[PDB]
Amino acid sequence: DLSYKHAILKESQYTIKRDVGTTTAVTPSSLQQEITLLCGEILYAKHADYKYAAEIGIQYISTALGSERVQQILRNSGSEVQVVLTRTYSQMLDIHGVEKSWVEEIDKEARKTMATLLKESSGNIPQNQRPSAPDTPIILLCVGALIFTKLASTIEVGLETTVRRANRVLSDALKRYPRMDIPKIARSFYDLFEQKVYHRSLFIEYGKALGSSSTGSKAESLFVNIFMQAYGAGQTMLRWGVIARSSNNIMLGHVSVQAELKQVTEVYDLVREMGPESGLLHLRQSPKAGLLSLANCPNFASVVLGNASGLGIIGMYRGRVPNTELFSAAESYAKSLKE
Amino acid sequence: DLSYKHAILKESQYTIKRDVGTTTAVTPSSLQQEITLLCGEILYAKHADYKYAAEIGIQYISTALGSERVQQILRNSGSEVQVVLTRTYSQMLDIHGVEKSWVEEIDKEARKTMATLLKESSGNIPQNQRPSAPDTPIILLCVGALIFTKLASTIEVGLETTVRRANRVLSDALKRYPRMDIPKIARSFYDLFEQKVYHRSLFIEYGKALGSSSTGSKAESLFVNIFMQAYGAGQTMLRWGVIARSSNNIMLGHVSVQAELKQVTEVYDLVREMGPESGLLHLRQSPKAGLLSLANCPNFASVVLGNASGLGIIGMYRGRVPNTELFSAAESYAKSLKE
Amino acid sequence: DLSYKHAILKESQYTIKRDVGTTTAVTPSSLQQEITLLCGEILYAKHADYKYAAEIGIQYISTALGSERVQQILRNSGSEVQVVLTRTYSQMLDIHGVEKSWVEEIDKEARKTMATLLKESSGNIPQNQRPSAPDTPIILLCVGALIFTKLASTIEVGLETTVRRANRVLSDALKRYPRMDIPKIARSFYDLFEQKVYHRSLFIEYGKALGSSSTGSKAESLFVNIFMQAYGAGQTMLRWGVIARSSNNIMLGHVSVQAELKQVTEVYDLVREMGPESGLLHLRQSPKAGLLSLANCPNFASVVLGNASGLGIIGMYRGRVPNTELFSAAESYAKSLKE
RNA sequence: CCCCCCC
RNA sequence: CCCCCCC
RNA sequence: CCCCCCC
RNA sequence: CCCCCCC
RNA sequence: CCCCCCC
């Protein structure tokens, strides 16, 4: 059945159309040196409103890939959003859907903070501490990638995890910019990813275009590391299933587990059939996701969760254990094997 | 039977949930230098109300371990208390559940006492006599640890013992701070330990995180000494039983003692089975405590109490002697062996 | 034969169905802070009718475990009772099967008593003497656990023992609430346990979920102590048999005792085979109980009862002595060994 | 319906 | 995020 | 039929 | 029910 | 609480 369902979904002669009357903003590569400034003036000043930081990160992505490539990416993502270009005025940027009041506020706040830290201090600002640093857009996109790995999770868990992991992953940027509010920027990125779902596709295309590069700075290598940490998002049950098989859990040989193993292997075969893009299904909110669910094998899922709980892997996972006796037996065996 | 009871209690697939709608306060490490001041402004001034001194000690513990680690500790203790962070205002602290009037009163009393002892005296206040000393939070937590060792006992015995032992254990702090009211601070700590039972788990986690440290001041070494003096709390009968076995008491060979020795050894085997965390069962008020009771062996308990009374160990122990003839015979033999 | 009987009972491919058209009440955790009030307004006032105090204790248990977990517990206990949720009205509770007149009467009686004790007295009601104390539901469940240990016994013995033991076990609660009628509350709990047998399973699940907790108050530790004192209910003959073996009674070597020792050891092997849940068989009224009866070994039972009578353990046990000569000989030898 | 930990 | 020794 | 004390 | 001394 | 000499 599962192969037939995927065959129906894949073999479609008709293309969906959505967001027909909508538009979005991009910034041409000719403005990259400008957007960098903006992407850094968000980082070293303490701003009251961090509402469009995610849009500025996506603007930098658009400068990197190019306006035409970004339009093509949005078009092939199933969304008929018409790209609107970015202009300059007196210079500053007039990004579509980003209020000019916001850009002026961010610029003025950063200029005032820079003046205050230059007047009082000894005037020895290093090359990495200024807003026009060239890795500041990647530093903002690193907060974006941290909150990207938690798009299958909830908002509160995502924000808490982003802050916790960014105090260590982004320690160097925090030292360079003492006053960068990872919570508010992470909230902005979560809002962008939820509202504009095609920007998940744009962000993934940037991740690919960055990982495929021949050279990169440490910021881009960090961004790619986090982006790849997001790969199996929304499918931790499959990873824990292969973990359970590697652990040689005895309760995998139970009668009901052996009964469901056929369709479990069917799900894994479907994973292989989709191939490399299967991992990005839940990150993209591809409607095709959910063909990879193991919820139709309650006993296998309970055994997998029990094995994970025994090994300590389960952590604070919020999934359901359908069959509690199998869960407890598997947990006991996994603890025994671990000890 | 006892092994089966412990097997039932330990092998539970369901987690309890309590204090669901409740919250508690923590203080981030970034405020440690501030909380230290507070924890010392309780010590060198004579305050009318010592109500929240225990909460300030626990706040310092939260600064030491960290807010996130403290939340995790509270969560793994079986209590679903939602941590509330600590803020500053004009600076002073606004601790959740601690009235700002109390903090202002403590600060003002300490400032007035400092002004009085500076105006009249010769102005030679040493570095250890000021409230901002860095061992003052540990000095307060030492009163807390003294009253911690008496949580299995009663309130009046606990307070009397705390004052008696603190006049000698904490003599140096008393010399440094002539006006520190060990009775009221001990009462505050007893109130905290009784009301918020998860703070027993927090206090034990601080004891572990301190004993595991590579270095420490003399205050922290004293705190760990007292904390370890609290280890076997609520189980002095087992310690006196192994004492009686070491004393080779002849009445241990009586018919009824030899009858009960099997299940006595069962209790000791259960002690070994639980392992290192068995000693902290009564300190934590773990409901699992009471599996270690020797009350179901009245003759063994009477012989043990008699041996203790003969050796002079019994002191003023308030336990019951079930069989008075065995108690008296064991006491006579123990006195004879002692002489 | 006994192993074969247990094999038949255990290896059943068919599940029983009972209480098909019946329903029961639970209270969601969101109402715990409310049910606590009710569970305490039963304790400090003198009520004419104590009819549903047991149902209110079970309601608190349902808040603790959760409505869904309680439904699952009732379902796995062999009873197809449909859980009915609890609602609020103007606030007070409308518990299914509990008349709103009863709840209004209890609330009004408690409010009138509180007004009388506040108007006449000096207005210094401590935090533990008020109905909204958080250990009041556990104090009611402690009377419930005392009457739980006497479910194998008769009603009159159970009530007498509950009152006698509660004057000492629950002395602190009695001091806090001078007017709490342990007899009527114990009668209510006995009625609940007899009528709704699935509530024995719910009460045992609460005992497990409480003993497995990492922390607990003194009320919960007391409840777990009593709950574990109930463990071997309905099987005091097996405990006295192992006592007789520990006593090395000479009449155990008699011809008929040695004749029956084989099937006696068979019963003990069956005990080990069932394992931890064997002790709760008579408490649950599991129909499988009675496989553990030693009534088919009249001479062993007579020797065991004689040994118990000699040691003074028999107390006022109402079992039958089949062979009086063995009983008297064993009693004489046990007294001789005791002296 | 699905998802849910850590890095 | 990653990296981190010696030759 | 079974259960039946004390804690 | 459990706990109960001293350090 | 612990420590406390000599070399």
Side-chain angles (χ1 to χ4, degrees):
Chain A
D1 278 336
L2 187 55
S3 172
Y4 284 170
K5 294 178 184 181
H6 181 230
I8 293 160
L9 285 187
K10 174 182 41 203
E11 305 317 308
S12 78
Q13 313 94 300
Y14 306 88
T15 74
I16 193 66
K17 305 198 191 342
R18 54 193 82 163
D19 310 346
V20 180
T22 76
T23 46
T24 190
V26 311
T27 307
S29 296
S30 303
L31 308 185
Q32 198 170 355
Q33 281 285 92
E34 297 149 78
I35 199 81
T36 298
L37 185 80
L38 203 44
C39 288
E41 283 169 337
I42 299 164
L43 293 181
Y44 73 100
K46 180 67 174 66
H47 303 294
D49 209 26
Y50 275 95
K51 185 184 182 187
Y52 305 122
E55 189 76 50
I56 311 308
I58 287 303
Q59 287 321 299
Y60 172 79
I61 286 185
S62 172
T63 66
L65 298 185
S67 51
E68 303 89 298
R69 324 291 321 180
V70 159
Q71 173 54 100
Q72 183 178 2
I73 286 155
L74 299 183
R75 173 195 329 137
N76 314 130
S77 78
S79 175
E80 300 219 27
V81 296
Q82 281 305 111
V83 171
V84 176
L85 267 193
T86 303
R87 66 213 59 226
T88 67
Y89 68 97
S90 305
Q91 82 185 6
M92 308 205 269
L93 293 153
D94 172 22
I95 311 174
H96 176 75
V98 164
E99 306 155 0
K100 303 162 64 174
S101 72
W102 187 86
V103 167
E104 294 156 15
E105 155 188 355
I106 300 296
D107 172 37
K108 189 211 170 185
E109 189 76 29
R111 298 256 177 212
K112 169 205 310 172
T113 286
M114 178 149 155
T116 300
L117 277 296
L118 208 48
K119 169 199 171 188
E120 316 302 329
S121 291
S122 305
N124 301 138
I125 285 188
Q127 287 302 301
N128 46 65
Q129 293 194 4
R130 34 151 180 71
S132 54
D135 49 6
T136 56
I138 316 286
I139 290 168
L140 196 80
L141 289 171
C142 277
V143 180
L146 274 167
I147 193 66
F148 193 68
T149 76
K150 302 315 279 306
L151 283 185
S153 184
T154 64
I155 179 171
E156 53 262 9
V157 175
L159 290 204
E160 182 65 26
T161 305
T162 298
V163 182
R164 195 211 320 118
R165 290 199 64 204
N167 290 319
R168 321 177 305 238
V169 166
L170 290 169
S171 48
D172 307 331
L174 280 157
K175 289 175 182 58
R176 282 164 50 189
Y177 312 110
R179 63 194 84 71
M180 75 160 312
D181 191 87
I182 306 163
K184 280 175 187 177
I185 302 176
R187 173 101 190 90
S188 159
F189 270 104
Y190 184 71
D191 283 348
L192 183 67
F193 288 135
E194 284 295 335
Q195 288 158 357
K196 317 192 162 194
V197 184
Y198 46 90
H199 278 161
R200 308 186 175 206
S201 291
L202 182 53
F203 190 78
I204 295 175
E205 289 323 298
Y206 187 65
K208 297 182 187 174
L210 209 60
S212 315
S213 294
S214 177
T215 66
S217 61
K218 301 181 187 298
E220 308 181 14
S221 197
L222 175 49
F223 176 93
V224 177
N225 276 352
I226 304 173
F227 169 74
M228 295 296 172
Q229 286 182 340
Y231 179 76
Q235 301 143 32
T236 68
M237 274 301 304
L238 296 181
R239 276 78 198 164
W240 282 358
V242 58
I243 279 181
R245 184 241 191 170
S246 301
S247 282
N248 283 317
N249 205 356
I250 55 158
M251 301 279 132
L252 275 186
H254 208 274
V255 176
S256 186
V257 194
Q258 286 273 131
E260 298 180 347
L261 278 192
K262 181 143 184 281
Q263 190 275 331
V264 165
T265 300
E266 277 198 7
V267 181
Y268 281 95
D269 290 342
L270 178 56
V271 163
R272 281 186 278 282
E273 181 166 70
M274 308 189 204
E277 306 284 327
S278 75
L280 315 165
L281 282 194
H282 278 84
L283 278 180
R284 257 161 176 150
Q285 291 180 356
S286 181
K288 201 162 70 161
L291 285 178
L292 309 178
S293 169
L294 294 178
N296 63 346
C297 313
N299 302 136
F300 178 78
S302 163
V303 165
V304 160
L305 288 187
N307 189 82
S309 181
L311 302 167
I313 298 176
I314 201 177
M316 186 64 72
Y317 186 75
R318 261 162 70 173
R320 324 161 310 150
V321 293
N323 186 206
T324 316
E325 288 283 73
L326 279 173
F327 168 85
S328 301
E331 172 187 20
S332 307
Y333 184 77
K335 288 189 288 184
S336 298
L337 201 53
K338 183 72 180 296
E339 193 66 69
Chain B
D1 278 336
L2 187 55
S3 172
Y4 284 170
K5 294 178 184 181
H6 181 230
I8 293 160
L9 285 187
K10 174 182 41 203
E11 305 317 308
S12 78
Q13 313 94 300
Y14 306 88
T15 74
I16 193 66
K17 305 198 191 342
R18 54 193 82 163
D19 310 346
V20 180
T22 76
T23 46
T24 190
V26 311
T27 307
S29 296
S30 303
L31 308 185
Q32 198 170 355
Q33 281 285 92
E34 297 149 78
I35 198 81
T36 298
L37 185 80
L38 203 44
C39 288
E41 283 169 337
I42 299 164
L43 293 181
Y44 73 100
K46 180 67 174 66
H47 303 294
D49 209 26
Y50 275 95
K51 185 184 182 187
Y52 305 122
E55 189 76 50
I56 311 308
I58 287 303
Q59 287 321 299
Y60 172 79
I61 286 185
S62 172
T63 66
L65 298 185
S67 51
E68 303 89 298
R69 324 291 321 181
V70 159
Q71 173 54 100
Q72 184 178 2
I73 286 155
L74 299 183
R75 173 195 329 137
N76 314 130
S77 78
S79 175
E80 300 219 27
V81 296
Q82 281 305 111
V83 171
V84 176
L85 267 192
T86 303
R87 66 213 59 225
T88 67
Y89 68 97
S90 305
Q91 82 185 7
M92 308 205 269
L93 293 153
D94 172 22
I95 311 174
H96 176 75
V98 164
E99 306 155 0
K100 303 162 64 174
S101 71
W102 187 86
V103 167
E104 294 156 15
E105 155 188 355
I106 300 296
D107 172 37
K108 189 211 170 185
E109 189 76 29
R111 298 256 177 212
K112 169 205 310 172
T113 286
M114 178 149 155
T116 300
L117 277 296
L118 208 48
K119 169 199 171 188
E120 316 302 329
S121 291
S122 305
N124 301 138
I125 285 188
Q127 287 302 301
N128 46 65
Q129 294 194 4
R130 34 151 180 71
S132 54
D135 49 6
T136 56
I138 316 286
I139 290 168
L140 197 80
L141 289 171
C142 277
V143 180
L146 274 167
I147 193 66
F148 193 68
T149 76
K150 302 315 279 306
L151 283 185
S153 184
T154 64
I155 179 171
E156 53 262 9
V157 175
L159 290 204
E160 182 65 26
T161 305
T162 298
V163 182
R164 195 211 321 118
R165 290 199 64 204
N167 290 319
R168 321 177 305 238
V169 166
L170 290 169
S171 48
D172 307 331
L174 280 157
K175 289 175 182 58
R176 282 164 50 189
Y177 312 110
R179 63 194 84 71
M180 75 160 312
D181 191 87
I182 306 163
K184 280 175 187 177
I185 302 176
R187 173 101 190 90
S188 159
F189 270 104
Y190 184 71
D191 283 348
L192 183 67
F193 288 135
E194 284 295 336
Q195 288 158 357
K196 317 192 162 194
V197 184
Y198 46 90
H199 278 161
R200 308 186 175 206
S201 291
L202 182 53
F203 190 78
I204 295 175
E205 289 323 298
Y206 187 65
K208 297 182 187 174
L210 209 60
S212 315
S213 294
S214 177
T215 66
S217 61
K218 301 181 187 298
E220 308 181 14
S221 197
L222 175 49
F223 176 93
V224 177
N225 276 352
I226 304 173
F227 169 74
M228 295 296 172
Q229 286 182 340
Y231 179 76
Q235 301 143 32
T236 68
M237 274 301 304
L238 296 181
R239 276 78 198 164
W240 282 358
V242 58
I243 279 181
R245 184 241 191 170
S246 301
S247 282
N248 283 317
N249 205 356
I250 55 158
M251 301 279 132
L252 275 186
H254 208 275
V255 176
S256 186
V257 194
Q258 286 273 131
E260 298 180 347
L261 278 192
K262 181 143 184 281
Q263 190 275 331
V264 165
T265 300
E266 277 198 7
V267 181
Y268 281 95
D269 290 342
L270 178 56
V271 163
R272 281 186 278 282
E273 181 166 70
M274 308 189 204
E277 306 284 327
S278 75
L280 315 165
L281 282 194
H282 278 84
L283 278 180
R284 257 161 176 150
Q285 291 180 176
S286 181
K288 201 162 70 161
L291 285 178
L292 309 178
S293 169
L294 294 178
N296 63 346
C297 313
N299 302 136
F300 178 78
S302 163
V303 165
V304 160
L305 288 187
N307 189 82
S309 181
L311 302 167
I313 298 176
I314 201 177
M316 186 64 72
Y317 186 75
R318 261 162 70 173
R320 324 161 310 151
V321 293
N323 186 206
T324 316
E325 288 283 73
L326 279 173
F327 168 85
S328 301
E331 172 187 20
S332 307
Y333 184 77
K335 289 189 288 184
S336 298
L337 201 53
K338 183 72 180 296
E339 193 66 69
Chain C
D1 278 336
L2 187 55
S3 172
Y4 284 170
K5 294 178 184 181
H6 181 230
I8 293 160
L9 286 187
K10 174 182 41 203
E11 305 317 308
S12 78
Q13 313 94 300
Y14 306 87
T15 74
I16 193 66
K17 305 198 191 342
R18 54 193 82 163
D19 310 346
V20 180
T22 76
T23 46
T24 190
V26 311
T27 307
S29 296
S30 302
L31 308 185
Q32 198 170 355
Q33 281 285 92
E34 297 149 78
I35 198 81
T36 298
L37 185 80
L38 203 44
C39 288
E41 283 169 337
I42 299 164
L43 293 181
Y44 73 100
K46 180 67 174 66
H47 303 294
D49 209 26
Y50 275 95
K51 185 184 182 187
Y52 305 122
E55 189 76 50
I56 311 308
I58 287 303
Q59 287 321 299
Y60 172 79
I61 286 185
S62 172
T63 66
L65 298 185
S67 51
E68 303 89 298
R69 324 291 321 181
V70 159
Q71 173 54 100
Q72 184 178 2
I73 286 155
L74 299 183
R75 173 195 329 137
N76 314 130
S77 78
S79 175
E80 300 219 27
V81 296
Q82 281 305 111
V83 171
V84 176
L85 267 193
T86 303
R87 66 213 59 225
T88 67
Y89 68 97
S90 305
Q91 82 185 7
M92 308 205 269
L93 293 153
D94 172 22
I95 311 174
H96 176 75
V98 164
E99 307 155 0
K100 303 162 64 174
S101 72
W102 187 87
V103 167
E104 294 156 15
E105 155 188 355
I106 300 296
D107 172 37
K108 189 211 170 185
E109 189 76 29
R111 298 256 177 212
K112 169 205 310 172
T113 286
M114 178 149 155
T116 300
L117 277 296
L118 208 48
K119 169 199 171 188
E120 316 302 329
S121 291
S122 305
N124 302 138
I125 285 188
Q127 287 302 301
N128 46 65
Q129 294 194 4
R130 34 151 180 71
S132 54
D135 49 6
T136 56
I138 316 286
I139 290 168
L140 196 80
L141 289 171
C142 277
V143 180
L146 274 167
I147 193 66
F148 193 68
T149 76
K150 302 315 279 306
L151 283 185
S153 184
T154 64
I155 179 171
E156 53 262 9
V157 175
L159 290 204
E160 182 65 26
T161 305
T162 298
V163 182
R164 195 211 321 118
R165 290 199 64 204
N167 290 318
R168 321 177 305 238
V169 166
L170 290 169
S171 48
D172 307 331
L174 280 157
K175 289 175 182 58
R176 282 164 50 189
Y177 312 110
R179 63 194 84 71
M180 75 160 312
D181 191 87
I182 306 163
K184 280 175 187 177
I185 302 176
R187 173 101 190 90
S188 159
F189 270 104
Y190 184 71
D191 283 348
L192 183 67
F193 288 135
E194 284 295 335
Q195 288 158 357
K196 317 192 162 194
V197 184
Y198 46 90
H199 278 161
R200 308 186 175 206
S201 291
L202 182 53
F203 190 78
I204 295 175
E205 289 323 298
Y206 187 65
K208 297 182 187 174
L210 209 60
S212 315
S213 294
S214 177
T215 66
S217 61
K218 301 181 187 298
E220 308 181 14
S221 197
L222 175 50
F223 176 93
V224 177
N225 276 352
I226 304 173
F227 169 74
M228 295 296 172
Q229 286 183 340
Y231 179 76
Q235 301 143 32
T236 68
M237 274 301 304
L238 296 181
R239 276 78 198 164
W240 282 358
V242 58
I243 279 181
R245 184 241 191 171
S246 301
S247 282
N248 283 317
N249 205 356
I250 55 158
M251 301 279 132
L252 275 186
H254 208 274
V255 176
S256 186
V257 194
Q258 286 273 131
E260 298 180 347
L261 278 192
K262 181 143 184 281
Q263 189 275 331
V264 165
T265 300
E266 277 198 7
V267 181
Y268 281 95
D269 290 342
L270 178 56
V271 163
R272 281 186 278 282
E273 181 166 70
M274 308 189 204
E277 306 284 327
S278 75
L280 315 165
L281 282 194
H282 278 84
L283 278 180
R284 257 161 176 150
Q285 291 180 176
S286 181
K288 201 162 70 161
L291 285 178
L292 309 178
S293 169
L294 294 178
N296 63 346
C297 313
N299 302 136
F300 178 78
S302 163
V303 165
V304 160
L305 288 187
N307 189 82
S309 181
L311 302 167
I313 298 176
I314 201 177
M316 186 64 72
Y317 186 75
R318 261 162 70 173
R320 324 161 311 151
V321 293
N323 186 206
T324 316
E325 288 283 73
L326 279 173
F327 168 85
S328 301
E331 172 187 20
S332 307
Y333 184 77
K335 288 189 288 184
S336 298
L337 201 53
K338 183 72 180 296
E339 193 66 69

